[PDB]
């Protein structure tokens, strides 16, 4: 390496530095769980919502096997952003969040995290502060507890008319939130091009709320869409894949080499020692000013 560093077959005499030893770390241990098997059973029945009626599940403190969940539907589109599609199943988080709604494959052009479509203008937006994913799927004929809407439908307008009846200002949907027009729009759109208006009070700042929507024909088997996002916390990272710990060795002490670890889904590598306590209790993790875990 010294010769390569100087590009020569005869290095001048001296004392010179070379790269450091890697220090041979021990095989990994974990502090993940206790918890209870995830409860994704709400997904097994009923009609999924129109895109502005979203149903959401949020999980904490629990253990899961998403591939068993995935086996229940046929997925015709799986993509993700800021995470590999495999790693979202393997990673422990402070929460697991799933949004679900009905969605025809005939409208599939309007759903991406980057879409400019009316689905994203007024019915759904996803934050990029979290690494969520997406799924388009259909229901197998043996899922009889699943039911379907008369038509698939969405809001294609949501704006407020100025009190002088000329100027109008759009109300785009907030990331991870329902648009304000949901208070006047019907649970499904009865006919394509239906629209509604609400006069607004001086307490509301005046003007008229205006909203409208569109519909798509029903299909023999229900089509569905999902939005999935995750949240990384610090001492709240209780959602993980079911443990593989059975048939292994006692954990976590080795003391020992600077062994790789995951504690409640927080990856890292290092050696532990039985030192004294510092405050404060129940925050779990302790850190320095440089964002390095201390203990």
């Amino acid at each position: 390496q010294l010769h390569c560093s100087y590009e020569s077959f005869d290095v001048e005499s001296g004392v010179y530095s070379v790269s450091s030893f890697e220090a041979k770390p021990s095989g990994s241990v974990v502090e993940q769980a206790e918890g209870v098997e995830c409860d994704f059973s709400p997904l097994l029945s009923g009609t999924p919502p129109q895109v502005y009626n979203f149903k959401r599940l949020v999980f904490t403190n629990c253990n899961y096997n998403l591939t068993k969940l995935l086996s229940l539907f046929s997925v015709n589109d799986f993509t993700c952003s800021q995470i590999s599609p495999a790693a979202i199943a393997s990673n422990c988080y402070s929460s697991l969040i799933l949004d679900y709604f009905s969605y025809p494959l005939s409208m599939k052009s309007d759903l991406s995290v980057s879409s400019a479509g009316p689905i994203s203008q007024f019915n759904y937006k996803q934050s990029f502060s979290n690494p969520t994913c997406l799924i388009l799927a259909t229901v197998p004929h043996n899922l009889t507890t699943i039911t379907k809407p008369l038509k698939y439908s969405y809001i294609n307008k949501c704006s407020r008319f100025l009190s002088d009846d000329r100027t109008e200002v759009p109300q785009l949907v907030n990331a991870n939130q329902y648009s304000p027009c949901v208070s006047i729009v019907p649970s499904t759109v009865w006919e394509d091009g239906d629209y509604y208006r609400k006069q607004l009070s001086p307490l509301e700042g005046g003007g008229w709320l205006v909203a409208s929507g569109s519909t798509v024909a029903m299909t023999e088997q229900l089509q569905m869409g999902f939005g999935i996002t995750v949240q990384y916390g610090t001492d709240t990272n209780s959602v993980c894949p079911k443990l593989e710990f059975a048939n292994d060795t006692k954990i976590a002490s080795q003391l020992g080499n600077c062994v790789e670890y995951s504690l409640y889904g927080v990856s890292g590598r290092g050696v532990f020692q039985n030192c004294t306590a510092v405050g404060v209790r129940q925050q779990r993790f302790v850190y320095d000013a440089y964002q390095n875990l201390v203990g």
């Binding site: 100087y6 001296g14 530095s17 790269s19 450091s20 800021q82 590999s84 690494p131 532990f272 964002q291």
Partner: protein
């Protein structure tokens, strides 16, 4: 409330110029010893950088990505090695002037009545240890090393030296060896007594310290007669100035402040490097392993590439900063060498250099990353004005003209001298009879006084 105030301007004592053959002369009637101090940094701490570990920690995707940039690291390592070599050169060059061909042995009770707290506790010195205790620097490297990182030590360690083994930093040991350094400073004390008795560049006088002091005092125009009368007084005033050094290690002492800032600058450079390990460049995480675990490899290395590039950029900035500091230290080291070969090895007539009180012997001790100088100096006080003449002549014979050597001719104000004129030393008010030892023959001049009666030099 804070008070607005004018900045004071001290006015010099005014002395009126006078017309004709005589003039007003200002002379001090008291004095005090005093000291000043300086810190001359001579080195930058020497460090090296593992250029693989700073960027990434053996992940295999980054190892392959890093290869496209491998020549930058080679430039980085080479630049750092050259900077460290220059630091070693300055140390050896300094020590070459520090050493002497010969020296006195040193024992307790050296310097007689002078207190000499600087003597080693045979050792370094109590003064050097006070400096080391006042400095707030983190606990030293090398031994025990690795066990101040590792769990076989206190949980309360906060040393950046443990972080040295995370970041891949290496602190090189100083070349000088603190025990050899102490030997070198004692060798300088052994050259004392002394610098006088001609150039001193061959011979070694080997005389008592007090004798060399009296010689230096006579070298600034204090008469020998005064020196013999006040010998105990001189030692007492000298020791008072020396005793003040125990209060000298304070934050208002600017030389002390500079020592602490030299330590702060070395620590600061490393702390900047440590903080950059956590600095994302828009990357999803500062950890390479974390972004690998979360991403498919075609996407994964877009994140890795951004992270690598910013990390390389901070290394480049760091190297440039070190090169600049190394050069300034080399220049500062040359200044220290000059002072050892001027302010310490000899009494000087230049003013300027050394503490501002004429010059009398100065001393130097070890300080972290440098030398700390202390300068004894002479401060005049209680100035009075006297009548003085440019010279004297024989009124009966105009070619008999004299003028004082290393002193002045003043009208006498003393009851023991019958002669109307008296010789004085130039450093202190001390009138005495005019004799051939204190005067020399000179060419005649119109301003010399014409003496018509009693002048002993020449008698006729």
């Amino acid at each position: 409330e804070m008070r607005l105030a004018s900045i004071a301007f001290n006015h010099p004592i005014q002395v009126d110029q006078l017309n004709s053959s005589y003039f007003k002369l200002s002379i001090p009637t008291n004095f005090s010893f005093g000291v000043t101090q300086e810190y001359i940094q001579t080195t930058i701490q020497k460090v090296t950088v593992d250029c693989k570990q700073y960027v990434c920690n053996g992940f295999q995707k980054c190892e392959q990505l890093l290869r496209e940039y491998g020549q930058f690291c080679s430039k980085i390592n080479q630049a750092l090695h050259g900077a460290n070599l220059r630091q070693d050169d300055s140390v050896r060059n300094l020590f070459a002037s520090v050493k002497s061909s010969q020296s006195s042995p040193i024992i307790p009770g050296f310097g007689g009545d002078f207190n000499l707290t600087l003597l080693e506790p045979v050792a370094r010195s109590a003064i050097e240890d006070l400096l080391f205790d006042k400095v707030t620097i983190a606990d030293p490297g090398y031994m025990q090393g690795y066990d101040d990182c590792m769990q076989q030590g206190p949980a309360s360690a906060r040393d950046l030296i443990c972080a040295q083994y995370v970041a891949g930093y290496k602190v090189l040991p100083p070349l000088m060896d603190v025990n050899m350094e102490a030997a070198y400073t004692s060798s300088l004390l052994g050259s004392i007594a002394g610098v006088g008795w001609t150039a001193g560049l061959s011979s070694f006088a080997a005389i008592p310290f007090a004798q060399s002091i009296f010689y230096r005092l006579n070298g600034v125009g204090i008469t020998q007669q005064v020196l013999s009368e006040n010998q105990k007084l001189i030692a007492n005033k000298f020791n008072q100035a020396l005793g003040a050094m125990q209060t000298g290690f304070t934050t208002t002492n600017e030389a002390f402040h500079k020592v602490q800032d030299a330590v702060n600058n070395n620590a600061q450079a490393l702390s900047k490097l440590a903080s950059e390990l956590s600095n994302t460049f828009g990357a999803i995480s500062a950890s390479i392993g974390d972004i690998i675990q979360r991403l498919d490899p075609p996407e994964q290395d877009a994140q890795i590439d951004r992270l690598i590039n910013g990390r390389l950029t901070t290394l480049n900035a760091f190297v440039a900063q070190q090169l600049v500091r190394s050069e300034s230290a080399a220049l500062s080291a040359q200044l220290a060498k000059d002072k050892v070969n001027e302010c310490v090895k000899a009494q000087s007539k230049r003013s300027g250099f050394c503490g501002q009180g004429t010059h009398i012997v100065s001393f130097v001790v070890n300080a972290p990353n440098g030398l700390y100088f202390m300068h004894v100096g002479y401060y005049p006080s209680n100035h009075i004005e006297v009548v003085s003449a440019y010279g004297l002549c024989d009124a009966a014979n105009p070619t008999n003209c004299i003028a004082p050597v290393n002193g002045y001719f003043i009208k006498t104000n003393n009851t023991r001298i019958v002669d109307e004129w008296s010789y004085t030393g130039s450093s202190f008010y001390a009138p005495e009879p005019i004799t051939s030892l204190n005067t020399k023959y000179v060419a005649p001049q119109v301003t010399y006084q014409n003496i018509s009666t009693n002048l002993p030099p020449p008698l006729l």
